[PDB]
Design a protein around this ligand. Sequence first.
Ligand SMILES: Nc1ncnc2c1ncn2[C@@H]1O[C@H](COP(=O)(O)OP(=O)(O)O)[C@@H](O)[C@H]1O
Ligand SMILES: [Zn+2]
Ligand SMILES: [Zn+2]
Length: 698
Amino acid sequence: SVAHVALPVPLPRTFDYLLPEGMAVKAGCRVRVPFGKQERIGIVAAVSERSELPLDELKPVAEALDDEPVFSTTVWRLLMWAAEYYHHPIGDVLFHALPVMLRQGKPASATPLWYWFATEQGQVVDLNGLKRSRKQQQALAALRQGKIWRHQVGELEFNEAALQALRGKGLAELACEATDWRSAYSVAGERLRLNTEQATAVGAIHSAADRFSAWLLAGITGSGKTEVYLSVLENVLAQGRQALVMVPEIGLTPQTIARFRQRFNAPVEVLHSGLNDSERLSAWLKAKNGEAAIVIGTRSSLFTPFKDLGVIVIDEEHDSSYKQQEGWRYHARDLAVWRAHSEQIPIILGSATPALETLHNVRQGKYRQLTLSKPAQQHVLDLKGQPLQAGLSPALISRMRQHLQADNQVILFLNRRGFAPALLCHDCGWIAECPRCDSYYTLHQAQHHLRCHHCDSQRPIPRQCPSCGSTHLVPVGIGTEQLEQALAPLFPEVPISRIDRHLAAVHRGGARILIGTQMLAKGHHFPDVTLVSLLDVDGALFSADFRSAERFAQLYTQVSGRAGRAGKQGEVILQTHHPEHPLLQTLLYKGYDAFAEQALAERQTMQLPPWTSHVLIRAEDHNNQQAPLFLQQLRNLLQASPLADEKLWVLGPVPALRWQILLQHPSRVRLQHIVSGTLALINTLPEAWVLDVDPIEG
Ligand SMILES: Nc1ncnc2c1ncn2[C@@H]1O[C@H](COP(=O)(O)OP(=O)(O)O)[C@@H](O)[C@H]1O
Ligand SMILES: [Zn+2]
Ligand SMILES: [Zn+2]
């Protein structure tokens, strides 16, 4: 009688409509409803016999677009929970989970694809006639060889006009075409690749395959993590169940795709960024109907429906790209784990450098670890008192030339762009710390001051180091200053190129300097690189962002096993003003896992994630000012709201690395409800504003 309908609007509620008699429609189905004078597509959240709004103002539902729900029960429950946890409007959440074509109210069914083909006559006709009809002979000559899809005519030189003219002469016609892989699926033969550790990992996952279990597959690069994924998948597909494989945004390489395609005598569906809406819907349907054995995709592939999902694999579990930074700011990994729990299936998280969140979860009961085991010389250069050219010390340049004149490649790594730096003395290594809290000052040269972020303290930029008297105070964490402009005159006629995602000149080998700011794609290798230098180690060690050391440790550990693998002797050089920094020392001589153990214990002392939960609230006001006051009002509304516990820790209005406030709490659930209540009632009108649960900051 009454349908509670969700719309793709920035409002956290459902609009009511009347259900005319005869119109069958459950929750999870799409509807066409009136909205003002115009018309809108919506989703039925709930169907009640009851009454909610003024009954007379209730307009009826214009059309029921789906007979059956477009989300499954567990996926539906997942999205309901995600909306509650991320505090994002239920309508936007639900519509974001659907393909574009289904958002627009089109049928949830596979569109037929049509082709032109040469008729019986067109195959034999004297090619002496069309020799005066312009494009039609070219159109038919192509048709002689094979069919031509309609969505490909635009890539050719003859058009639909040339083809429809052949149609009228009876020489071309239009037709379209109509699938069970489980029968005739060969589990492959005993072929016996797996080693001891690999087989144990496969066995352990197999022995618990009929329930939920979150596994961390922790192994260094080359240990054969992918090989375990492939074997696990074989078992799952042997049960006639489907699989989802998630990779980072840059992970869908032709080599990776070919690897999966060749291993499985079963359909593999790849959700890459080049697909159009039809192709995406087609893939969505193939998965929903159980026709796709394996789906490979990136962050959004999490929302794909499955007739019978049997396993989830997330490769490069630590990658940032699993966190959506625009609109609905969900984390694909967490939601995937949630999805695995509700469906009661295994999820396998794979990384050579697992997130601290993940290692914490393993240390506690949450995840189970399966480990895989099975040279590169490293130098630490002291920048203190060194005359730099392009941020490069004499010692590094000396090593660089010895690699370049040997006709080899060199990679330099930097700290992206836009990040706000710390300030230190180039001569004695003094760092600007806040006097109140032991926290590094963030340098704001555009604002002419140093600002604390753990507390809120103002201090002007010193002209000289107060410790040693030197004027050579430098900003650390700046690499956007077009390094090539200084590298070209330092390295004459040597080609300079950027890695960050035509550039097949890298595969040519020879003397070359490569510049990167982010971690490299899986399988994507640089065999001609024999020297890797990590510039601005200080930017990572003295950042206001508490996760910078983690990201650096990951970057360092990745690139530590890519300096010309097996073939040539690789060299890793790090430049820093503090060579004997304890954290850095642990990383360099003990490895990532030991860094992680120490970093994790320091997170506990400082009461930081993953030991606590975080929620950010950002604001962007043109007014540069007043906006902090809006957050000041929101701070006070957050104070006395039921649930104080003298555990809730709120950072007052502090500018970002744009303004923000920070909420911290030992309990994830409690912090959710504190935000739930404070957002339920909002007092002053918002003109300035986003909400970020579990922020990765970067
Ligand atoms: N046991 C193996 N079988 C096949 N290929 C392997 C094996 N070990 C390593 N490789 C190759 O080395 C690269 C990285 O190893 P991979 O098996 O993907 O493990 P990981 O996922 O830990 O990097 C891949 O490109 C892969 O082709
Ligand atoms: Zn401070
Ligand atoms: Zn000094």
